[PDB]
Every structure is written in C-alpha cells, then in structure tokens.
C-alpha cells in the first residue's frame, strides 16, 4: 500500500525549470500550519506568517504550534508531504547555516538572514516565495535566542557609543565553522512590539518579583528546615560589594500595601512568564545519527 501522505497543489502554473528547483528540496522539512489533507500552496510554508511591525517572536510563537512535515515526492501537478512520526527515522536537508555533526540535537527556528545577500532566492511564484525555518543544533539555539533578548534591551539607548559597539558584537556570533551574523531587532529608532512584549515579559519579573518575595521568605525562615532560607535572605539584598558600615542588613520590603491590591501583583507576576514561555524552553525535534558527506543530507530520528 502507498504510504500515507499530504497532497498539495499550486493554483499557479509551474514552469518546467521551476519544477526542477523543487527536486533539490525533496529531502527538506516544510512546516504546515495545521494538519489537513489537500492544502493550497498559499497555506504552505512559513511565508504566510510574514509581517511588517511584528518581530521575530511572532514567527517562533506560531511555529511552535505548526505541524512539521517532510517533503516526499513531487508529482508535478501535486506534491506529497509525509508527516514524521515520533521515534522513527527521517532524512532532513541541511537548510541551516551550520554544519551538522553526528548526534547533534537539532531544533527548528525561524530564519534570521542578515544584511548582505547570500544564497536565498529560489522559488518566486505569483509574487510569493517558499521560505523555510532554519534547522539548528540545540546549543546554538540556546545562544541565538538570547542574543536577540539582550539587543532588545539596548534598543532604548543607541545614543551612546559603548552600547553602540556592544550591540555589534552580539550581532556577530562566533562559533565553529562559518560565522553568521544575527540581524539587529532595532529598526526605525524604535523596537518592534513583539520584542517589546518579550523584553517587558522579562522586565516585570526582573523588578516586580523582588519586592513580592520579601513578604513570604521572612515567615518561612522561622521553620528552619534546610537552613537555606536564612542564607537566601542575604541574597535578596542584591549587593555586589560587601556592605559598608551602614544600613540596611535587612532586605527592603513593601510597607502597608492595600489588602487586595497585593493579590493583583502576584497574579501579574506569573502571567508575564506565559508571554515569555515561548522563549523559556527550546525543544529538540530531531536527533541526527550518521551524517552524509559534504554535510548536506542527514539521518534524524523524529522527536515531539
């Protein structure tokens, strides 16, 4: 019996030269917004999510819910797209900038092409193109996701040269093999709302959590279980240098506070983590074993 597959068709006609460009993509991941059967090519790919004011966070936040799907066998008038099953082998193309060593924990990220042109343009079609997410090893995704979050904090202060130089280094990653610079989130002198929602999601916990924990640590400290709560109280001061011969030994704590308004600050604290939750945890979706020569084809068991 034929293997289960997802048929897809182009409303636009395909030139014979255009059909051959797909042959290079026969063994590459093609994200799909939702599991279906017949699918219009406008639904196909990550390109439908492209936005202007929206930042990089909008792509990854929706891409996590998307159903990843391999290319299978182009039929000309139709296109098969088998959905990978967990625990089973599946080839993937090295669309990502970095070469894949054996055993690397691959994971999906939206593409981050930068300034000067490189290889990129491939499938113009009806004023539309089939962009694909980068497939990256896990340790690099732990870094690339963080480089944007710091540059967003620096978006407020381009005025000074010190930040202006420091942003350039985070813009230029340095790792094994070829480096690939990360485009600056800053544009038009103002941060995009998606990175602003992400920077605010951290900035609330960065400050609001400080004065809310003080009320509760003092009462649990009396119980003296592991004794860590007494040592934890000194951590609350957030001092670097040792205290000068002056106050305060005790951490700062809120005074009075309305009986009900204090409850609202607690619920407001955790809810910011949910907006940040997309950035809190990268997840593996592929695990390569043996790697093909020239670091193009790969053999990855599926995950997720």
């Amino acid at each position: 019996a034929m293997e289960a597959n997802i048929f897809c068709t182009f409303d636009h006609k395909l030139s014979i030269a255009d059909v051959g460009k797909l042959t290079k993509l026969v063994a590459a991941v093609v994200p799909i917004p939702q599991r279906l059967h017949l699918i219009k090519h406008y639904q196909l790919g990550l390109h439908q999510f492209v936005d202007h004011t929206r930042g990089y966070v909008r792509l990854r936040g929706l891409l996590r819910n998307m159903t990843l799907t391999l290319m299978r066998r182009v039929e000309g008038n139709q296109i098969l797209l088998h959905v990978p099953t967990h625990g089973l082998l599946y080839t993937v193309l090295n669309t990502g900038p970095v070469t894949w060593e054996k055993g690397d924990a691959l994971c999906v990220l939206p593409p981050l092409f930068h300034g000067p042109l490189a290889r990129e343009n491939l499938l113009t079609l009806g004023q539309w193109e089939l962009v694909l997410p980068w497939i990256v090893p896990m340790p690099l995704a732990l870094e690339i996701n963080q480089r944007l979050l710091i540059m967003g904090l620096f978006s407020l202060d381009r005025s000074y040269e010190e930040v202006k130089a420091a942003v350039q280094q985070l813009q230029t990653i340095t790792f094994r093999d070829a480096t690939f610079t990360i485009p600056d989130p800053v544009i038009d002198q103002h941060l995009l709302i998606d990175m602003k929602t992400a920077c605010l999601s951290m900035s609330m916990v960065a400050n609001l959590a400080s004065e809310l924990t003080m009320t509760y640590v003092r009462k649990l400290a009396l119980e003296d279980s592991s004794m860590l709560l007494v040592k934890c109280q000194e951590l609350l001061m957030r001092l670097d240098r040792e205290r000068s011969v002056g106050e305060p030994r005790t951490p700062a704590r809120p005074q009075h506070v309305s009986p009900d308004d204090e409850i609202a600050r607690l619920s407001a604290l955790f809810v910011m983590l949910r907006q940040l939750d997309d950035l809190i945890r990268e997840q593996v979706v592929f695990t390569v074993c043996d790697v093909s020569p020239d670091n193009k084809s790969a053999t990855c068991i599926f995950k997720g």
């Binding site: 063994a27 082998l89 599946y90 080839t91 053999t299 990855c300």
Partner: protein, 49 residues
C-alpha cells in the same frame, strides 16, 4: 666548519612490481554462501553482502 660531524639518514620510496610464486593447493578456502543484510537509511535502503 664546526666541531660536529653530521650523518643524515634518508629513506627512499621505490615503486615495486612483485612476483608471487606458490605451490598448488597450498591452502583451503572454505566459504559460506553470501548473505544480504538490510539497513535502513531513511530514504535509500543500503545493503551489506
């Protein structure tokens, strides 16, 4: 000229076309029938006889 004698050594690689004589029936060659094991690369399926 210093006080030191020098005695360099130097290996030289020569291509050689050996001849190989041997007596009749000098050794047995018992053999099992060849067998096709099957692997599974995710697209093409390699074998190993």
């Amino acid at each position: 000229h210093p006080g030191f004698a020098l005695t360099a050594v130097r290996t030289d690689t020569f291509e050689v076309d050996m001849l190989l004589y041997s007596g009749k029936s000098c050794t047995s060659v018992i053999i099992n029938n060849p067998i096709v094991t099957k692997e599974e690369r995710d697209i093409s399926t390699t074998y190993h006889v």
